[PDB]
Amino acid sequence: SLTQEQLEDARRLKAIWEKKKNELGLSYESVADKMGMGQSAVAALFNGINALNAYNAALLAKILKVSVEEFSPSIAREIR
């Protein structure tokens, strides 16, 4: 089970994805491919089924062209 804060991280992440995927030219398929992971594995992060870690948070921040803190202030402090 995810903590409340991990569910809030995922909600912020999914909202950034939904806001930016068109301008980034990305799809449900192509962002998983960019992350070298399965489609449902990435959806799992966005939808709050699996929690983020520092590896995944960093890779998604780079792909989405945002700061980690915009979806996970806690991972962003600790990656720090």
Added chain:
Amino acid sequence: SLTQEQLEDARRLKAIWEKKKNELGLSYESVADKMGMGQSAVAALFNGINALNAYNAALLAKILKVSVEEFSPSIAREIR
């Protein structure tokens, strides 16, 4: 024109960027946004085209999770 020390600051900064950008989840775009500037201006600082100042050096050090002196000993003194 940059002095040799200013060019070394940039060089040392670029080396830290190359070392830490992936693990920290950094992109030119996310850095540019934090720095209130464009992506080419960020690159110009890394590439020794424009010189660092105290504000940009402090913010880049925070972003890269390093002390300023790791790339600019002279500007670190100015901040002190």
